[PDB]
Design a protein around this ligand. Structure first.
Ligand SMILES: *[P@@](=O)(CCCCCCCCCCC=C)OC(C)C
Ligand SMILES: *[C@@H]1O[C@H](CO)[C@@H](O)[C@H](O)[C@H]1NC(C)=O
Ligand SMILES: *[C@@H]1O[C@H](CO)[C@@H](O)[C@H](O)[C@H]1NC(C)=O
Ligand SMILES: *[C@@H]1O[C@H](CO)[C@@H](O)[C@H](O)[C@H]1NC(C)=O
Ligand SMILES: *[C@@H]1O[C@H](CO)[C@@H](O)[C@H](O)[C@H]1NC(C)=O
Length: 376
């Protein structure tokens, strides 16, 4: 069986922080830690009041001079478990089911004879950033793929979920064809937001507390806007009509050609700078140049557009289209476009009734991956 590298999505691996902060926003926030603690995922940090401590640690500071993000004064954030699976199997190191992400899939892989940290390895990254600020990650990923090729005697299967598919495409677009033909067996693409997702507009405008209803959407908006990855996943014109309205208000519409106005009108000009930094990273048309299995959920209501009676500090009414509840179905068109642009096979696989996250623990998804890895 071929070696496997797992690439997670946004929020898709643990992050750890170490503190030596000059000040804090509440007295009950820790100023200083002697070692790293888990900043994602730890539910006790997301309770009312305490979450102000968390936001102040996990937010990125955008520097207009350097056109780059930095951690707040006296904060370090690191990615544990690179080359291992623990940090993307469980987002919560207490291993509560709430943080269960790749765990079911890795249990299946190990059942099929894989070994954690050996011929199955994770490629976790700082998912708050876009690829322009994860250079070292891609060098480490190249080196790990080469090492696994050398140890286990064969090219590797990349398995990516959600935004991990965009990270993986960015990586493959920048490796020579000869390198990919040697080192990459296949790319199994799970719930890939090719061309971005509509849901980013609402996150940036009014915030999204859907998975944390005790906290105010305007409070979590501060953190969600600070993540470059959010602006990176705004809809692109290679998937969506430039005339498609994502946000309607009483006085103005916003299509994907209106992002500069959008960022001005929501009071977040840094987001426009982030979109300029990141919009060109993934080449619109250029396929990965490897055997590609495009698995996408359908039949789950998926936010498509937003109507705001009051903008931007109130929840909108939501208009839904087809998809997996997160990734719009239109994202799958991109796979179809690649059939005619690369010699390697592009196989499309609809997962009807498969929700974005549940598809990672779903018997039909795992049965598909098993056929790819162990053969007929
Ligand atoms: P995927 O990687 C793609 C879905 C993109 C939706 C972006 C919204 C941002 C959420 C909070 C922002 C804070 C960092 O999806 C994962 C698996 C959920
Ligand atoms: C912003 O970036 C530049 C270059 O790294 C530097 O002059 C400055 O220290 C940074 N600003 C802040 C507030 O950290
Ligand atoms: C498509 O989007 C890119 C930037 O993301 C833009 O530069 C380009 O002009 C657009 N092309 C159109 C609308 O024809
Ligand atoms: C936005 O366009 C919609 C249809 O796309 C239209 O009904 C509405 O009048 C427009 N809004 C504004 C403020 O022009
Ligand atoms: C698992 O995915 C399949 C394939 O689309 C789907 O039919 C089924 O509803 C899913 N199971 C669950 C529990 O969601």
């Amino acid at each position: 069986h071929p070696p496997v590298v797992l690439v997670p999505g946004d929020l898709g691996n643990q992050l750890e922080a170490k503190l030596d902060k000059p000040t804090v926003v509440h007295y009950l926030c820790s100023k200083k830690t002697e070692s790293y603690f888990t900043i994602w995922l730890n539910l006790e940090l997301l309770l009312p009041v305490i979450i102000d401590c968390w936001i102040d640690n996990i937010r990125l500071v955008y520097n207009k001079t350097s056109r780059a993000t930095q951690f707040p004064d006296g904060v370090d954030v690191r990615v544990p478990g690179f080359g291992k699976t623990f940090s993307l199997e469980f987002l919560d190191p207490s291993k509560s089911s709430v943080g269960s992400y790749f765990h079911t899939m890795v249990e299946s892989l190990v059942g099929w004879g894989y070994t954690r940290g050996e011929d199955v390895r994770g490629a976790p990254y700082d998912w708050r950033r876009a690829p322009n600020e994860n250079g070292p990650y891609f060098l480490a990923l190249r080196e790990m793929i080469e090492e696994m090729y050398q140890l286990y005697g064969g090219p590797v299967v990349l398995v990516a979920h959600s935004m991990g598919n965009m990270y993986t495409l960015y990586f493959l677009q920048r490796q020579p064809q000869a390198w990919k033909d040697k080192y990459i067996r296949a790319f199994v693409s799970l719930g890939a937001p090719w061309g971005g997702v509509a849901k980013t507009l609402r996150v940036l405008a009014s915030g999204d507390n859907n998975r944390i209803p005790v906290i105010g959407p305007l409070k979590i908006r501060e953190q969600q806007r600070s993540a470059v990855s959010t602006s990176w996943l705004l809809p692109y014109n290679y998937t969506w009509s430039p005339e498609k309205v994502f946000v309607q208000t009483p006085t103005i519409n916003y299509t994907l050609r209106d992002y500069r106005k959008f960022f001005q009108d929501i009071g977040f000009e840094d987001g426009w700078l982030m979109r300029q930094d990141t919009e060109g990273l993934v080449e619109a048309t250029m396929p990965p140049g490897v055997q590609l299995h495009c698995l996408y959920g359908t039949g789950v209501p998926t936010p498509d557009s937003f109507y705001y009676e009051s903008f931007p500090d109130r929840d909108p009414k939501i208009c839904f289209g087809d998809g997996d509840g997160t990734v719009n179905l239109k994202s799958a068109l991109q796979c179809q476009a690649w059939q005619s642009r690369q010699e390697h096979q592009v196989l499309l696989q609809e997962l009807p009734g498969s929700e974005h996250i549940e598809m990672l623990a779903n018997a039909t998804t795992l049965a598909y991956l098993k056929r790819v890895l162990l053969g007929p």
